[PDB]
Write an enzyme that holds these catalytic residues in place. Sequence first.
Site, PDB file in Angstrom:
ATOM      1  N   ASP A 165       0.842  -1.199   0.000  1.00 34.23           N
ATOM      2  CA  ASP A 165       0.000   0.000   0.000  1.00 34.23           C
ATOM      3  C   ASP A 165       0.876   1.248   0.000  1.00 34.23           C
ATOM      4  O   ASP A 165       0.641   2.191   0.753  1.00 34.23           O
ATOM      5  CB  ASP A 165      -0.941  -0.002   1.223  1.00 34.23           C
ATOM      6  CG  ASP A 165      -2.070   1.022   1.109  1.00 34.23           C
ATOM      7  OD1 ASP A 165      -2.248   1.619   0.025  1.00 34.23           O
ATOM      8  OD2 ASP A 165      -2.784   1.233   2.111  1.00 34.23           O
ATOM      9  N   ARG A 169       0.184   8.942   1.365  1.00 37.08           N
ATOM     10  CA  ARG A 169      -0.573   8.913   2.617  1.00 37.08           C
ATOM     11  C   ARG A 169       0.066   7.964   3.637  1.00 37.08           C
ATOM     12  O   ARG A 169      -0.253   8.010   4.828  1.00 37.08           O
ATOM     13  CB  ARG A 169      -2.018   8.469   2.347  1.00 37.08           C
ATOM     14  CG  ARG A 169      -2.125   7.037   1.846  1.00 37.08           C
ATOM     15  CD  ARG A 169      -3.559   6.658   1.475  1.00 37.08           C
ATOM     16  NE  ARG A 169      -3.579   5.404   0.726  1.00 37.08           N
ATOM     17  CZ  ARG A 169      -3.518   5.325  -0.600  1.00 37.08           C
ATOM     18  NH1 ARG A 169      -3.446   6.430  -1.337  1.00 37.08           N
ATOM     19  NH2 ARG A 169      -3.493   4.139  -1.191  1.00 37.08           N
ATOM     20  N   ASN A 170       0.959   7.102   3.163  1.00 35.34           N
ATOM     21  CA  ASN A 170       1.675   6.169   4.030  1.00 35.34           C
ATOM     22  C   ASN A 170       3.161   6.539   4.158  1.00 35.34           C
ATOM     23  O   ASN A 170       3.995   5.716   4.551  1.00 35.34           O
ATOM     24  CB  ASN A 170       1.520   4.740   3.495  1.00 35.34           C
ATOM     25  CG  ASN A 170       0.273   4.047   4.034  1.00 35.34           C
ATOM     26  OD1 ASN A 170      -0.166   4.321   5.153  1.00 35.34           O
ATOM     27  ND2 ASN A 170      -0.297   3.143   3.241  1.00 35.34           N
ATOM     28  N   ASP A 183       2.709   2.142   7.445  1.00 37.56           N
ATOM     29  CA  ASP A 183       1.484   1.524   6.960  1.00 37.56           C
ATOM     30  C   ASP A 183       0.441   1.688   8.048  1.00 37.56           C
ATOM     31  O   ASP A 183       0.534   1.071   9.103  1.00 37.56           O
ATOM     32  CB  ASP A 183       1.705   0.039   6.678  1.00 37.56           C
ATOM     33  CG  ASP A 183       0.497  -0.618   6.039  1.00 37.56           C
ATOM     34  OD1 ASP A 183      -0.490   0.089   5.742  1.00 37.56           O
ATOM     35  OD2 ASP A 183       0.538  -1.846   5.831  1.00 37.56           O
TER      36      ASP A 183
END
Length: 305
Positions: A165, A169-170, A183
């Site tokens: 992912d 945003r991570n 994460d």
Amino acid sequence: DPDELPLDEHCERLPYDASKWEFPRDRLKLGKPLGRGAFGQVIEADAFGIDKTATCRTVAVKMLKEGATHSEHRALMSELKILIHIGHHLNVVNLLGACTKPGGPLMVIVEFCKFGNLSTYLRSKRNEFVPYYKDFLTLEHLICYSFQVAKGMEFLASRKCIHRDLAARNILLSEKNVVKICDFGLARDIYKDPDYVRKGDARLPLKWMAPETIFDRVYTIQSDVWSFGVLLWEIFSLGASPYPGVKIDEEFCRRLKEGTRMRAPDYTTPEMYQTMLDCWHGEPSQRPTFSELVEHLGNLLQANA
Ligand SMILES: COc1cc2nccc(Oc3ccc(NC(=O)/N=c4\cc(C)o[nH]4)c(Cl)c3)c2cc1OC
């Protein structure tokens, strides 16, 4: 090949050495929540003496919340074991300790990154950006962030882990322009987040996912390279959302298969855009490795100087 196998897969056999990692509950003061998902959350806290004798330290603590079950508790424990096994790196969020003793919640304690996720940060800086005035973002900063994330990913790959992912945003931003791969997992509310699209019963970060992952459901380190390319686009858009205005349907996925790619973002250099294009090669084996991205971005970092 079992050696290819991500440690993520068989976490249940990984050791937890409490004599090393267990932090006394009575030395952790929980403060306000920083973020919340459906089943997990991250809370700001003060840990007394966790990394330095007698020193108060602001930390972030991941734990579960109302709605979670034993299965999420098991998942969080596996996450803790993974973090321990990965080991320390500047560009991965650093594990400081955990509370695992019965009588309270499982708590995973990591270093606090005061500026939060990179996407939101970069947008707040559009007003304070110049390509080449203190506290101002510059092109060098953008290249430096990209380099750091490539380093962290190269490191993760070397520990036999894959992210699955990877996105702005991570990525978290700490002091002195250090970025850390994270994460959020359960601590993000993915059914409320636009970035995650409903496909079947699952909600997936489609706009970041490689073609082979979308169509064949294969996750490899090279599909992380594809996601890294999207992350690059985010960085050089100063935190824009990818494929803006585009409806993420099955026709989108087909177009992607055909060779449709995003146009260059507003703050990119030509070389950085070519790098994104390289990361978005339809053939996974023809994408650069993170080792190659590290060398290449380091060269770009020096040329921009
Ligand atoms: C200022 O605002 C925040 C600052 C933060 N600073 C540090 C850490 C934060 O949240 C976490 C994010 C992720 C994880 N876990 C995590 O990254 N686990 C991993 C990573 C990998 C490779 O394998 N497991 C944890 Cl514990 C905490 C933060 C969240 C904030 O606002 C919401």
